[PDB]
Amino acid sequence: QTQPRQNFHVESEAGINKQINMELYASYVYQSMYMYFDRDDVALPSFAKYFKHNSEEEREHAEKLMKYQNKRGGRIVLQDIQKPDLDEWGSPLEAMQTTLALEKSVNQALLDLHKIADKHGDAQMMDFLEGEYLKEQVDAIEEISDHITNLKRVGTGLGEYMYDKETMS
Amino acid sequence: QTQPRQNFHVESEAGINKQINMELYASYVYQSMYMYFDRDDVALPSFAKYFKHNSEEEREHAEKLMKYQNKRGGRIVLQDIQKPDLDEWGSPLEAMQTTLALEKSVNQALLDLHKIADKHGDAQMMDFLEGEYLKEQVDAIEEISDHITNLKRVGTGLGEYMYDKETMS
Amino acid sequence: QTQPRQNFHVESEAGINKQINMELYASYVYQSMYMYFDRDDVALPSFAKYFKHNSEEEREHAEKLMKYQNKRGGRIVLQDIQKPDLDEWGSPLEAMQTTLALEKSVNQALLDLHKIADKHGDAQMMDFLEGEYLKEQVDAIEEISDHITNLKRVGTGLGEYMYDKETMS
Amino acid sequence: QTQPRQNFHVESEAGINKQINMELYASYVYQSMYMYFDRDDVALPSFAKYFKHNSEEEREHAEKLMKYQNKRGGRIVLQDIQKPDLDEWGSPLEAMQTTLALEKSVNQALLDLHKIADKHGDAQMMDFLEGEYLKEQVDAIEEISDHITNLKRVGTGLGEYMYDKETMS
Ligand SMILES: [Fe+2]
Ligand SMILES: [Fe+2]
Ligand SMILES: [Fe+2]
Ligand SMILES: [Fe+2]
Ligand SMILES: [Fe+2]
Ligand SMILES: [Fe+2]
Ligand SMILES: [Fe+2]
Ligand SMILES: [Fe+2]
Ligand SMILES: [Fe+2]
Ligand SMILES: [Fe+3]
Ligand SMILES: [Fe+3]
Ligand SMILES: [Fe+3]
Ligand SMILES: [Fe+3]
Ligand code: NA
Ligand code: NA
Ligand code: NA
Ligand code: NA
Ligand code: NA
Ligand code: NA
Ligand code: NA
């Protein structure tokens, strides 16, 4: 076995590799939304900045899981990062609704990964996932839900522009 | 020949004199737009200051070409600065669409001037035009495109006022 | 046509999209090398940090090309980011030799993209590529060449450790 | 019952007393390694300081568990602190390999103590152990694994001396 390995099951190791790829995938989706709102015919620069920041956060989530894999004596196995499902993301409201679905799918994957750790008595991995991932996902999901509600309230046109200026900046 | 002159074709010299006049013309157009948005019956003061600043930048572009003409040993020959095509420029959206057309025509003139330098092997003039003019024009055309998109999004009335207050200020 | 588009050929637009993917691919390679030297059984933390930094730099190279695509009126089309060719990278010397080959392939691809711009008279794109990409590539290639020479000089064992402590950070 | 006692099983109380002694034992092992590397015929002062620091940390781990025992209404019952298995600890590599085994034994004991808390539904004790002990043990085991790898890489003689100077201090 690797030097650090203790109470670390191969199924947990494999599950961490799967979650690493999912975090990178999310980072790529947000990078695409970033550059979509940077288009001259969309031109909402604080939305663009918001997705730039979320793309960087997802990349950090991936690297923290990579570091954790190494810390436990697992071996990182990278997979292709699949391109996002769309090249264009619609209105600010539609992009936020897409983001809510993405963050809920990531959250479900983390909960499933936590279940693997629980199944194998990996108390430290469960605590790592809870404090470093599950808590952040609950915060992120509520924040996106707030965005969607406000975007529905302000409507299209001037409301989108003001939301870019007031909340997203 | 003038003391500095080296690898500097009379056709490039003549082309710089033509471009100097075009920069001064663009400066005059923006000065007219500045004072149009300064009218009591238009009264959008940040739009006014935006065109004031662009008028000053265009004058700086013309003076930098005048200095370059002297530096290469060319001789500056000034022409009349033609008045702008209109006395009044319509809505903020229409004024910005007019500005996009102006900046694209200046850009095409600069590209044509670059072709003259290339035809005569004027490597230094090509680099001067690329770094000091071509790059700036691409940035300017994108920025104006962003303005047009945002002005379409916010609409007339309150939207034009808020655009003045948020983006243009 | 998109609002900004001027003197911008579809072949150049397509080549930029291809180069974006290659920059992202190189970022992924360096991220893998980062986490490889982070392994408990490799444990060279300044090599790790070097590849972390180079991964971040490649991601910025990609995003600068994405921003340039938008500025010229092109449309970003993302593709899958392929996983690196290896899961582990051997010695510090072998990883640096792999890095040299990677940077030379990126450089040849950028030179080929420059040839597309030249073919279509895209003066501004050539200057953008020269100043923002070609210059950095010859600096990076020389720097990696220096690393390879020093790694050959110091040998394996204590030499790799000291190079980590003294040159890499 | 003692005033604070709530949801605190006698088996968990006894397990904490056992772990207190194990932390004290680890502290004593590190204090011995500290003074071994302080010997005139070993004379690696940064290794010495490293084990001095680790001896203090283990003593703090013990005192934090004693404090927790009191907080829950348990009663501390101290046992003899057994002397370390050796009087001399060999090479830096051998000492680090011994410490990896020690930290893995401590980690297994903590995981077994966590199982006792789980068996009796002691949610607060499980969280205390996870956040204050299990996380630290995973970090410590990885750090020692790094040391072992580097010590194998640099070899004996000058490599040991340089490791003392560069990494340990
Ligand atoms: Fe994430
Ligand atoms: Fe739990
Ligand atoms: Fe917990
Ligand atoms: Fe100009
Ligand atoms: Fe690059
Ligand atoms: Fe040429
Ligand atoms: Fe050139
Ligand atoms: Fe150039
Ligand atoms: Fe301890
Ligand atoms: Fe405001
Ligand atoms: Fe305001
Ligand atoms: Fe040093
Ligand atoms: Fe030193
Ligand atoms: Na923009
Ligand atoms: Na694939
Ligand atoms: Na006024
Ligand atoms: Na005249
Ligand atoms: Na490490
Ligand atoms: Na001494
Ligand atoms: Na005894």
Numbering used by the authors:
A (entry chain G), B (entry chain R), C (entry chain H), D (entry chain B): 3 to 171
Reproduce text from the manuscript describing this model.
Ferritin represents a ubiquitous class of nanocage-like proteins that are primarily involved in maintaining iron homeostasis. Accordingly, ferritin plays a central role in taking up iron (as Fe2+) and storing it in a stable and unreactive form (as Fe3+-oxide/hydroxide). The crystal structure revealed that TgFer presented a typically 4–3–2 symmetry in a cage-like, spherical shell composed of 24 identical subunits, featuring highly conserved organization in both the ferroxidase center and the 3-fold channel.
The Fe-binding position in the ferroxidase site of TgFer + Fe is consistent with that of TgFer. In the crystal structures of TgFer and TgFer + Fe, only site A of the ferroxidase center was occupied by Fe-1, but no clear electron density indicative of a metal ligand was visible around site B, similar to the structural features of Marsupenaeus japonicus ferritin (MjFer). The Fe-2 and Fe-3 ions (intermetallic distance Fe-2–Fe-3 of 6.10 ± 0.09 Å) with occupancies of 60 and 70% respectively are each coordinated by three water molecules. The Fe-4 ion (80% occupancy) is coordinated by the three OEs of Glu132 residues (distance of 2.75 ± 0.24 Å) from all of the 3-fold symmetry subunits and three water molecules (Fe-4–Wat1 3.12 ± 0.14 Å, Fe-4–Wat2 3.07 ± 0.08 Å, and Fe-4–Wat3 3.17 ± 0.09 Å distances), while the averaged Fe-3–Fe-4 distance is 4.30 ± 0.10 Å. In addition, the 4-fold pores of the TgFer cage are defined by the 4 E helices from symmetry-related subunits, forming a four-helix bundle to which four Fe2+ ions (90% occupancy) are bound between the negative potential pore layer formed by Glu168 residues. Although four iron-binding sites are coordinated by four Glu168 residues in the TgFer + Fe structure, similar to that previously reported His173 residue for RcMf, the E168A mutant has little effect on the oxidation rates compared with TgFer. Similarly, significant differences in the iron contents were observed between TgFer + Fe and TgFer + CuFe proteins, which were measured at 2,637 ± 2.46 and 240 ± 0.97 atoms per cage, respectively.
